[PDB]
Amino acid sequence: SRFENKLKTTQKHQIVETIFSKVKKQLNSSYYLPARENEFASIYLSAYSAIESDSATTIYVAGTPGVGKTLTVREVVKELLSSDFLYVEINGLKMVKPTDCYETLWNKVSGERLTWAASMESLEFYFKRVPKTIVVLLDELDAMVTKSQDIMYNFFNWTTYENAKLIVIAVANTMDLPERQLGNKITSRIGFTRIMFTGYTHEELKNIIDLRLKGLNDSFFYVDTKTGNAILVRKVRLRMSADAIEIASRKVASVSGDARRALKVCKRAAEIAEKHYMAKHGYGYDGVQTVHITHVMKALNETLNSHVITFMTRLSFTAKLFIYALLNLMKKNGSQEQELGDIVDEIKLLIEVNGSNKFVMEIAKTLFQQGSDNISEQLRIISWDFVLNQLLDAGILFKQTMKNDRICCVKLNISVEEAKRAMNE
Amino acid sequence: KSRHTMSMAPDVTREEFSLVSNFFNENFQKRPRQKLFEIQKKMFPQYWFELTQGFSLLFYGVGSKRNFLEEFAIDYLSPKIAYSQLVNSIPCLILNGYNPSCNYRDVFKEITDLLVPAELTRSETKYWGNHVILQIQKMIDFYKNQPLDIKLILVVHNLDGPSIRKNTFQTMLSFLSVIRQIAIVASTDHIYAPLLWDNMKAQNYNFVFHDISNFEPSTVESTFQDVMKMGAEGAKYVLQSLTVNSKKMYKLLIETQMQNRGTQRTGVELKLFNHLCAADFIASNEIALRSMLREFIEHKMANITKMEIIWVPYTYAELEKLLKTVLN
Amino acid sequence: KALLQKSSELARTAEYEQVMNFLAKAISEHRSDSLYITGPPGTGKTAQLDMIIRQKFQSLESVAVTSINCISLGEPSSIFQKIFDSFQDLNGPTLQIKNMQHLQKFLEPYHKKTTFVVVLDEMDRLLHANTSETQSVRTILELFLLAKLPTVSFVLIGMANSLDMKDRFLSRLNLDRGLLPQTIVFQPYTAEQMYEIVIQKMSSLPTIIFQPMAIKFAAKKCAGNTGDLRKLFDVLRGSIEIYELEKLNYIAKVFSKFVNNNSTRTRIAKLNIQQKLILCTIIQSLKLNSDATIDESFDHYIKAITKTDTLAPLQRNEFLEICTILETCGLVSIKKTKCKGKTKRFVDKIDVDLDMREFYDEMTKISILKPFL
Amino acid sequence: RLSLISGIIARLMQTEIFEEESYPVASLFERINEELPEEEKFSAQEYLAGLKIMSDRNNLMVADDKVWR
Numbered sequence A: 001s002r003f004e005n006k007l008k009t010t011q012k013h014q015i016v017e018t019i020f021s022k023v024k025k026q027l028n029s030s031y032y033l034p035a036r037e038n039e040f041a042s043i044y045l046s047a048y049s050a051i052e053s054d055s056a057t058t059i060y061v062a063g064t065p066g067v068g069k070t071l072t073v074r075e076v077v078k079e080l081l082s083s084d085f086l087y088v089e090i091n092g093l094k095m096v097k098p099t100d101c102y103e104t105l106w107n108k109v110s111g112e113r114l115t116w117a118a119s120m121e122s123l124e125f126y127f128k129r130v131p132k133t134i135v136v137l138l139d140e141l142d143a144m145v146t147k148s149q150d151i152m153y154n155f156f157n158w159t160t161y162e163n164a165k166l167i168v169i170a171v172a173n174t175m176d177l178p179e180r181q182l183g184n185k186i187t188s189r190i191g192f193t194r195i196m197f198t199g200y201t202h203e204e205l206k207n208i209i210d211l212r213l214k215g216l217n218d219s220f221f222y223v224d225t226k227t228g229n230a231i232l233v234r235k236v237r238l239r240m241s242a243d244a245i246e247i248a249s250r251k252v253a254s255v256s257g258d259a260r261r262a263l264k265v266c267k268r269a270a271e272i273a274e275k276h277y278m279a280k281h282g283y284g285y286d287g288v289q290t291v292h293i294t295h296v297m298k299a300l301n302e303t304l305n306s307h308v309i310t311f312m313t314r315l316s317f318t319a320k321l322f323i324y325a326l327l328n329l330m331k332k333n334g335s336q337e338q339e340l341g342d343i344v345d346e347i348k349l350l351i352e353v354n355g356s357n358k359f360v361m362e363i364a365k366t367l368f369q370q371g372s373d374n375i376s377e378q379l380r381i382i383s384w385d386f387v388l389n390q391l392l393d394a395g396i397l398f399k400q401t402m403k404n405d406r407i408c409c410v411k412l413n414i415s416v417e418e419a420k421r422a423m424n425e
Numbered sequence B: 001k002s003r004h005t006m007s008m009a010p011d012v013t014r015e016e017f018s019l020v021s022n023f024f025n026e027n028f029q030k031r032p033r034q035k036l037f038e039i040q041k042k043m044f045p046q047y048w049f050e051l052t053q054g055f056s057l058l059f060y061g062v063g064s065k066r067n068f069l070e071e072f073a074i075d076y077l078s079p080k081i082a083y084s085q086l087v088n089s090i091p092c093l094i095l096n097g098y099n100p101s102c103n104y105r106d107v108f109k110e111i112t113d114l115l116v117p118a119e120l121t122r123s124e125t126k127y128w129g130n131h132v133i134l135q136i137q138k139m140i141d142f143y144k145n146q147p148l149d150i151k152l153i154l155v156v157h158n159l160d161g162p163s164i165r166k167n168t169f170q171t172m173l174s175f176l177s178v179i180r181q182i183a184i185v186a187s188t189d190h191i192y193a194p195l196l197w198d199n200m201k202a203q204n205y206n207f208v209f210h211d212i213s214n215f216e217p218s219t220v221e222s223t224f225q226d227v228m229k230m231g232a233e234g235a236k237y238v239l240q241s242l243t244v245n246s247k248k249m250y251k252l253l254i255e256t257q258m259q260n261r262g263t264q265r266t267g268v269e270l271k272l273f274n275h276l277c278a279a280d281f282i283a284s285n286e287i288a289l290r291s292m293l294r295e296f297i298e299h300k301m302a303n304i305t306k307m308e309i310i311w312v313p314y315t316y317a318e319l320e321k322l323l324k325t326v327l328n
Numbered sequence C: 001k002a003l004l005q006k007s008s009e010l011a012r013t014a015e016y017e018q019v020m021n022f023l024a025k026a027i028s029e030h031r032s033d034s035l036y037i038t039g040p041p042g043t044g045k046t047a048q049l050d051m052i053i054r055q056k057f058q059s060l061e062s063v064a065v066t067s068i069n070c071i072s073l074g075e076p077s078s079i080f081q082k083i084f085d086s087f088q089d090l091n092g093p094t095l096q097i098k099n100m101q102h103l104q105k106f107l108e109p110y111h112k113k114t115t116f117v118v119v120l121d122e123m124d125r126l127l128h129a130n131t132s133e134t135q136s137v138r139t140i141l142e143l144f145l146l147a148k149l150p151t152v153s154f155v156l157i158g159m160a161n162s163l164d165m166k167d168r169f170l171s172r173l174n175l176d177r178g179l180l181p182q183t184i185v186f187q188p189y190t191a192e193q194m195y196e197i198v199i200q201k202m203s204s205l206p207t208i209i210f211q212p213m214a215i216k217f218a219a220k221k222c223a224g225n226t227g228d229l230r231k232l233f234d235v236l237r238g239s240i241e242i243y244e245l246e247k248l249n250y251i252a253k254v255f256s257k258f259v260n261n262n263s264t265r266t267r268i269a270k271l272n273i274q275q276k277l278i279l280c281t282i283i284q285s286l287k288l289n290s291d292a293t294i295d296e297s298f299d300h301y302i303k304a305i306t307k308t309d310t311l312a313p314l315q316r317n318e319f320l321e322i323c324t325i326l327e328t329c330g331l332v333s334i335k336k337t338k339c340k341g342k343t344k345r346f347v348d349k350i351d352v353d354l355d356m357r358e359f360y361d362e363m364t365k366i367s368i369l370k371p372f373l
Numbered sequence D: 001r002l003s004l005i006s007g008i009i010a011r012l013m014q015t016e017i018f019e020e021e022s023y024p025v026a027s028l029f030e031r032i033n034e035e036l037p038e039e040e041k042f043s044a045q046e047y048l049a050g051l052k053i054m055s056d057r058n059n060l061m062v063a064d065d066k067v068w069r
């Protein structure tokens, strides 16, 4: 509150707004909904029963993030705001300590700063003494319930009271959370009244996309060809070809079906087309537009492809030698676990199996001494420590910790197959 | 390799066990105990004259000393020798060595106030830097020039206790027993008692030994220790507190596992077990079945090996007892 | 219908007789009965003792008696200050609430000699406190021994969830002394007492609640695996508010829904066809009952889908996301189990709960996956 | 006697021919006479009594007579 003005400055020289900029601006992840429709009404009537009749209950909901559930409960308690309650976003992943929730509670009840002990004392007091409904958002409950479930034990034993002025809207990640860590006695108080949230269909994805594109779909801007500014000097129009939207929705609904992923990949393709259009005209930063299928094709493929292959095809020749030797060892001993000094021996092998060829001579020389016969006769190859580390920290290679550097183990984290393929290019 | 396993044993409830131990230990060899005791009581002035020279009196010999320990100490030694000094009878500091909650720090915190607080020695209390040993060093330097009379009588039951035998506690008690104005008398049970003290600790103790064998049942000592009787009967109370569906499903389990001591060959396969608990219309599927089974498993109330054998390790006798008594 | 079905959810128990027998000493000022209640979870044993003390105080000479809740203590000092809370005064409690002897010193009545008896609600946190033979068994021994000289003592009215507490007690002490003997049990009441408590609170019975015989049907087919008829009553109020939303039919439906997705909602749990494919792939790897790693099952997926050309297989990270989805619905569990190869190695051993028969229905309906069964 | 027919009703609950724990009384008739057992299906009141045993032993319930929960 107090520091909010401290973030507002004046020097702003009419920041230029291009087309795709406005697009992504409404395409922001922040600003009725189609996907969760009957769930909306269901939770709405649950809280309506619990509050309009002045009772106390436990609304459990679970499901993977990105299913709108955080937005959905917020919409419900927002329409309910217009018709007693304290929307207290107790996010276990926001709580510095686990117990910190208490204090927030211990504050929101009276506005006091004491320890968690007196916190819960006065909390239960209020829950069983106060004569006569405050929606506490148990966001990402898992973090809070990790040590011995005592936290959730309290958080629901509070709820079980009848005249307790305490409604809880708990959201967990997985469905079986109450049945894998919570106590059986706790699980009972949790109850069977839990609403599950499925994934999202590519139909729903199209719906949410066109929703974010309602006032902007295929719409017209007034763009000055000189500066690239857009106003919702030619009146240009823009179309967001719903076929790419279709294919993105299909792909996301396939593996995950997440609103966050879909929104973000749409934004990604949008800004890619944006930077191409900017480059084609060079407006800097101070007829008709579209978004081809190829844009989203690139932006989506980039969210799947890895780099380990395209990385290992670029390591130092020493590194590639190391890896290839390690693979020879893996197939020779069938153990997929080698000893480091043993790998050194194998590298010596690989260098000497080829004849005294002048080129093998050069390799031997440099790889054992950077020329300069003056200094020579290295035990283990040059940079060997260095390349070993450059691999290890890069997550490719994985090594145990023994100060004895000739019997310490070494293992590939990546698949042997992809590594071999990388060697084949 | 068919060994006699304690499983195949006639178990005895805690009440019957306790009560028969009472009857025996209070009536088994009474006349021998009292004859022995009235005979050995004549040795008490001998102990008086021995402790006149502060020789730490260690007591060995089979049977518990605890009773006899408090008997000789509290009743004979303390007040008589107090009167003999020329008034509170010298506080008998009894050490429940069998009690594993004894700690050198707190017992010395007691000892301190028991001993002379002639100066504000609390000022010498410091960091964890042990003022037990340094302060007792100072206390010994003090007593080296003090008159010679017992100002406290400490007695340890079972000097081989799980706490006192800790070498730190032992060394503390050694440097303590160096003091002349205190009378040290204790006893052990560990046959390996002499393994505890080097010539340094012996020099500190100046142990003089005496046998006392009266063949006691070690009443208090039986309390802190514990054996397997102190499982089948564990689950016997669990099943007494369950739901009727659990009762019926375990009834079916126990029939199909007792049909063929309840051995593993006599169990059932979970395939046919699901077939049954679905035929009689109890189990809807395998998940609910294994759920209503793990409530037994999550307290180790039935065994499972592999066929998919779920075999109750509880004896055929105890199993059919469950049937005839608590199940039907 | 609303104002009823809303209000629907807003001495008394027959059990009240039994404890009353064990209470005769408390309404005649004698030393109270040695009461150690145990109870299986769900039966309301906490709220059972709470109805007890509530009626006992709303029914009754000066009338003072309390019952404190032992949750966040793990130690026997601040507990008894919570009994000093009944004096409405201020003293130095630190010792007089800590040691048993100080407790005896602490409990000589002051106002009129109306006996005060003590109750410990939810001892199943002190019973379930720190290491047994060190503090919790020690705390139990201390608080539990009633060796006072005035027979007007702190007669513990205790409560424990799991029976093992009585097995954890010292063998010698429990048989001849303490609050232990009256180890009253309160086994799950299918309908016979709890359903009648339901009816007696539901005396003001809404007109069309529904078929009472179907109500008892719900009661039985839940209490099979259930101990909350009030919470089953709440899922019933949710059912009738479903009837409202559409502007005892649907209760069998909602049971088949919430209890086991295996019935029909597994198809929802595996909505995507690739989810079903990866699940059947896990089932195939089950033929090698080994560490069902990401790697094991992933390579199995690769080979079995190169064989069955349904679709180009998924990426490693893709398979990760899919199995995580499968775990979010909980149809298949995972655990980062330890292997001893290099160091303490933590890899995903998974376990599926589905059966090929519950795959028979859900796969034979989809002839496209059947190429992989 | 009723054991084996209860097992048959079990393996017919395995499939979704009941689509539920509920089942039409029509399905009842379809699954008493049309199946293997001939005349092992007792008198009307008698097999109803068998079904009432199966109710009191928590195996089959009665509600919405045209179906049975």
Ligand SMILES: Nc1ncnc2c1ncn2[C@@H]1O[C@H](COP(=O)(O)OP(=O)(O)OP(O)(O)=S)[C@@H](O)[C@H]1O
Binding pocket: A028, A029, A030, A033, A034, A035, A036, A064, A065, A066, A067, A068, A069, A070, A071, A072, A140, A208, A259, A260
């Ligand atoms: N129906 C919808 N309409 C518009 N945007 C939506 C919709 N559903 C999801 N989103 C977007 O996707 C985001 C998903 O957020 P939520 O699923 O509500 O949060 P979440 O599921 O709790 O994830 P967490 O917090 O990690 S458990 C929302 O914040 C919106 O940005």
Ligand SMILES: Nc1ncnc2c1ncn2[C@@H]1O[C@H](COP(=O)(O)OP(=O)(O)OP(O)(O)=S)[C@@H](O)[C@H]1O
Binding pocket: A160, A185, A188, A189, C013, C039, C040, C041, C042, C043, C044, C045, C046, C047, C048, C160, C161, C189, C193, C194, C197, C227, C228, C229, C230, C231
């Ligand atoms: N027989 C009953 N009489 C009164 N209320 C009951 C009864 N059974 C259940 N309830 C109510 O439903 C709740 C469910 O029981 P729980 O509270 O979960 O069990 P509890 O009170 O913690 O004691 P337990 O079973 O040892 S965990 C109770 O707390 C009561 O509010």
